Design an enzyme around this catalytic site. Sequence first.
Site, PDB file in Angstrom:
ATOM      1  N   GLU A   5      -4.278 -10.541  12.715  1.00 43.86           N
ATOM      2  CA  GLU A   5      -5.654 -11.279  13.150  1.00 43.86           C
ATOM      3  C   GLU A   5      -6.914 -10.204  12.667  1.00 43.86           C
ATOM      4  O   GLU A   5      -7.943 -10.828  13.032  1.00 43.86           O
ATOM      5  CB  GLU A   5      -5.702 -11.718  14.538  1.00 43.86           C
ATOM      6  CG  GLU A   5      -5.653 -10.558  15.478  1.00 43.86           C
ATOM      7  CD  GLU A   5      -5.246 -10.708  16.685  1.00 43.86           C
ATOM      8  OE1 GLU A   5      -4.953  -9.752  17.642  1.00 43.86           O
ATOM      9  OE2 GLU A   5      -4.550 -11.676  17.115  1.00 43.86           O
ATOM     10  N   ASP A  63      11.543   1.935   0.393  1.00 44.21           N
ATOM     11  CA  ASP A  63      11.194   1.964   1.936  1.00 44.21           C
ATOM     12  C   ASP A  63      10.865   3.440   2.527  1.00 44.21           C
ATOM     13  O   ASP A  63      11.583   4.183   1.893  1.00 44.21           O
ATOM     14  CB  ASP A  63      12.260   1.378   2.884  1.00 44.21           C
ATOM     15  CG  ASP A  63      12.091   1.173   4.350  1.00 44.21           C
ATOM     16  OD1 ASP A  63      10.833   0.604   4.681  1.00 44.21           O
ATOM     17  OD2 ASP A  63      12.538   1.712   5.252  1.00 44.21           O
ATOM     18  N   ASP A 116       7.420  -1.057   0.303  1.00 43.46           N
ATOM     19  CA  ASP A 116       6.726  -0.997   1.647  1.00 43.46           C
ATOM     20  C   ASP A 116       5.663  -0.137   1.811  1.00 43.46           C
ATOM     21  O   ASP A 116       5.749   0.891   1.326  1.00 43.46           O
ATOM     22  CB  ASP A 116       7.599  -1.219   2.788  1.00 43.46           C
ATOM     23  CG  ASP A 116       6.943  -1.110   4.052  1.00 43.46           C
ATOM     24  OD1 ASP A 116       6.479  -2.425   4.391  1.00 43.46           O
ATOM     25  OD2 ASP A 116       7.233  -0.326   4.977  1.00 43.46           O
ATOM     26  N   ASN A 117       4.673  -0.463   2.644  1.00 45.84           N
ATOM     27  CA  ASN A 117       3.359   0.605   2.827  1.00 45.84           C
ATOM     28  C   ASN A 117       3.010   1.021   1.669  1.00 45.84           C
ATOM     29  O   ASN A 117       2.441   2.206   1.654  1.00 45.84           O
ATOM     30  CB  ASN A 117       4.255   1.803   3.848  1.00 45.84           C
ATOM     31  CG  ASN A 117       3.268   2.419   4.556  1.00 45.84           C
ATOM     32  OD1 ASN A 117       2.192   2.054   4.543  1.00 45.84           O
ATOM     33  ND2 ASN A 117       3.668   3.621   4.793  1.00 45.84           N
TER      34      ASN A 117
END
Length: 217
Positions: free
Chosen positions: A198, A140, A168-169
């Site tokens: 979205e 992380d 992550d990322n």
Amino acid sequence: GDTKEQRILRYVQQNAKPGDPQSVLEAIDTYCTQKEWAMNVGDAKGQIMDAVIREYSPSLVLELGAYCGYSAVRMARLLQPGARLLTMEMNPDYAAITQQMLNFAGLQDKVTILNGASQDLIPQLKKKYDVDTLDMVFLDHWKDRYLPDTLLLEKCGLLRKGTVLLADNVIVPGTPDFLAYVRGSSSFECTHYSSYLEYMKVVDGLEKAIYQGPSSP
Ligand SMILES: [K+]
């Protein structure tokens, strides 16, 4: 002046319900999204974390890197009875905020915060914290530390066949060395997750790399 991480904690303390992890998570997310520091972390990052935790039901999780404690709260709230999380972070301010966030959420009994450098603490995990091998590792915040930490976990014999690494990322062209390593290695089976919400552009990307050990299956 107050740091961003201190301001996130203060918002949780003022607005969230003590002992309610969902409330804490929602507060962090709401505040950071409003400030445009991080957009809809629950949907983009948290859902993927939850799915991985639920798939493997790890008894021992090591988190490498922490900032405000969102990730630690996210994972700890899903740990099975008897399971534990060790969270390692070098920045003492970030480590302190993470501890306070877990306390507020009511999760501190499941977590041990280790404030120090991974190069120093990882070789001590077996003797100091009763670790055989890890079931899951969550990488992380600090992209440049993902590869050297992975290599050190291997050197220290902390990974077993089936240990899940979740980073992550990881969004192309970022983390080029870490991705090149796990994807290129016959010792890691890899899956990439891209959350778009979205929209048309990736909001968060995560890499799951499952260690296979050094031998044939
Ligand atoms: K691979």
